[PDB]
């Protein structure tokens, strides 16, 4: 009656599957390609950008409180440059970028490569560049979502397929090349970012290439640099998962209290200038500066996080100092982020989930020896743990931390601890964060209709 | 316009995104449970019937031709029973069940557990310890599924999510606990095992419970014990990434010549017998009884293939033995799968893969000393390569090769290989196995039944 109906529809189906054009494909490949080249170019400009920081620093090293005034008017100038450049020229390329390129993937959120790619690019280039705590993967996946766009509409490829798919490789592209981590891009792309509610065509066939061609153009210029070099840290046996479970308890109640923290204060410091584009200028100029100067006075509460994580893994941190660090480093990347720089939060989540597993680890190897304990491990598997628990993307989590550490015998704490955390953040009532800032953003455009 | 309507809609549902019910989430727990004792069961019985197989030839080991003839015998009476029960009790049971269970979640082909899970788990375990080219995987993944199957029906869920996910979690329960692969259990349900054409409501999360306590109830009962023990390798420079493009086109373009063998000798054998029940059973019953003898002189050519999987990747392989395993191993994988048996063609593909892989390698190797290369590279990156030129699930290929072998420094070949696979499989026009299977027992039942 209907099973009959749908059974000749389905062997019609299966007798062709993936069979994507080959026009998909090409373009996809320079679609990685391009988001690869862009990627590489924007790690060295925020590279260059703070060894001339440093340089301006130990230029004047006589003066105490002269050198922390330039320490402030040098990072505060580049942040004025990247929020005057997002605020005058492109209100839809501040924030993180996956929320405005998901919502992209669902077809909304028009995507305008002319003005996001070199205000995204310069802007996300002076507010990395100066020091604040933000990660350079979100300035990335918006590149990469509008570096797709601009191929498709530059060889003006038709079809619904292309556009889904060429937004989707190309943000995929761009979280392969800022974490040199090739997986962890497809488990992005096909767990995170794709419309979870429908179904759209987009070719795991073409992500791979773009995937594949941007992690080699990482790989080109980037030679023999680890972005996250942990050791070989011990195994855990079969009496020692039930702590995982229990961190994975702990950073589920912490990661939605984070969710609604960011998504309070980013309107918090709205109610500051309430959108003059002057007063919001001067008041990232303020915090931009502030995390400046705090790159130099106590230097590691600034910055993108990701030269304490082989610290805090190996032991090197006392408890007081953990407390202090994962204190002032939430403060500062709750301000960062949520005040309209152009900077994502993964890894400023990758780097405050290791300070909280090293502070549960620590705990655990001194409560009881009976298990032998290290507490790296513990910080290994809450790395992407509020990566879990927060934006609430598991697999990916565990996925990209296995990319960038290396240690594979600890994939079943990672994964306990990670599953731990997205059901705890589950039952406290713990929307993910990328969907609730897109949800967000669109409510306010609704609301901006009447 | 009804974009506003989408917007709305999309709003509403952005808000609530990724909120499974704790009933689907306790219940995935306690079907990767019971799916990984299972599994264990089922390995241990394979074990104990290839030990005492092999065992009572040394015990009764008077002269050479009572030593063939006791071996012939004792694989092939182990062999019928396999295909007795199976031609008797439960059809479907025959082949692997990947296209079965991968049926059964598009609400075709009924899984009828009170007839496949006996069926499945004794003739299973009949036909594999004669030491038939069998999986372990494919009468794992059936019994997970019909184990999810199962524990639905007896605690009584209803919904539409509910059936989707349990299945989806005993597949996936099933892969984890046959290869000690907690991520790849997820991967070949997200990307493979999924309706592929029309949205299903398969929480990951209950995927993700059922991976874990599967792998947990693996790792009580055989700790210590790897399936595939490699060490670590060279890594691969990036001006050797071109080889292995050449090694994916390779395995490509063999891809769909193998699938046309497997579809068309699974008819070759059909007319033997002609759906008989005593010719069947006397023809699986000859074709086990070859690959036990198989099994005992000359023996890396028969049994499950994980053997030689560590030999063949740099050991002491020669080009002539490498020569004779593979069209040895294809023409005994294809005799044993063709027919009908219970046992899964996902795990002796990979001892394909590596066999291919290490000859390409060997030959690349002797053909230039200025890249210093390495065989046992080129076997790990073309493992999981006939299982993406194939089957086409180039991820899951993928994971699953980075979790049995330890090796992350050759993602980028693995990722490139696979690539190469699954595109020069496209371009010459094959269909995936897994699917093309499914399309002609879906022919079948319309057509030739009613």
């Keep these: ?214 992690t080699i153009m990482y790989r080109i210029f980037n030679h023999e640099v680890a972005l996250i070099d942990v050791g070989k840290l011990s195994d855990a046996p079969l009496n020692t998962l039930w702590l995982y479970l229990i961190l994975g308890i702990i950073f589920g109640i912490f990661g939605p209290i984070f969710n609604k923290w960011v998504l309070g204060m980013q309107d918090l410091l709205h109610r500051v200038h309430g959108g003059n584009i002057t007063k919001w200028v001067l008041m990232g100029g303020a915090i931009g500066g502030l995390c400046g100067l705090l790159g130099f006075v106590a230097p590691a509460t600034s910055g993108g996080g990701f030269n304490l994580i082989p610290i805090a893994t190996a032991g090197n941190f006392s408890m007081g100092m953990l407390v202090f660090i994962f204190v002032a480093r939430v403060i500062t990347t709750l301000l960062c982020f949520s005040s309209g720089a152009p900077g994502g939060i993964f890894a400023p989540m990758l780097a405050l989930g290791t300070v909280l597993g090293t502070a549960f680890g620590m705990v655990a190897v001194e409560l009881f020896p009976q298990y032998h304990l290290e507490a790296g491990t513990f910080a290994i598997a809450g790395m992407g743990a509020l990566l879990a628990a927060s934006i609430r993307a598991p697999l990916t989590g565990i996925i990209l931390v296995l990319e960038m550490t290396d240690n594979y015998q600890l994939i079943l704490p990672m994964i306990i601890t990670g599953l731990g955390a997205t059901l705890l953040a589950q039952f406290t009532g713990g929307k993910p964060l990328y969907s609730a800032i897109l949800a967000r953003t669109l409510a306010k455009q609704e609301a901006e209709q009447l």
Tied chains: 1, 2.
């Design 1 to 214: 009656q209907a099973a009959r109906l749908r059974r000749r529809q389905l062997i019609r189906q299966l007798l062709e599957r993936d069979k994507t054009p080959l026009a998909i494909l090409f373009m996809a490949a320079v679609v990685g390609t391009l988001v690869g080249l862009a990627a590489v170019a924007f790690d060295k400009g925020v590279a260059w950008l703070q060894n001339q920081r440093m340089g301006a620093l130990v230029h004047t090293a006589d003066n105490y409180p002269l050198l922390l005034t330039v320490a402030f008017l040098c990072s505060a100038v580049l942040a004025m440059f990247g929020y005057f450049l997002v605020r005058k020229y492109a209100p839809e390329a501040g924030g993180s970028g996956i929320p405005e390129i998901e919502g992209a993937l669902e077809d909304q959120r028009p995507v305008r490569w002319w003005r996001v790619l070199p205000v995204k690019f310069f802007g996300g280039l002076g507010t990395l560049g100066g020091g604040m705590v933000l990660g350079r993967e979100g300035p990335t996946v918006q590149i990469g979502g509008n570096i797709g766009r601009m191929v498709l509409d530059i060889f003006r490829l038709k079809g619904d397929e292309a556009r889904h798919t060429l937004l989707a490789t190309g943000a995929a592209a761009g979280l392969a090349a800022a974490f040199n981590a090739p997986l962890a891009g497809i488990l992005f792309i096909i767990e995170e970012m794709r419309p979870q509610f429908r179904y759209t065509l987009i070719s795991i066939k073409a992500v791979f290439i773009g995937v594949i061609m941007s």
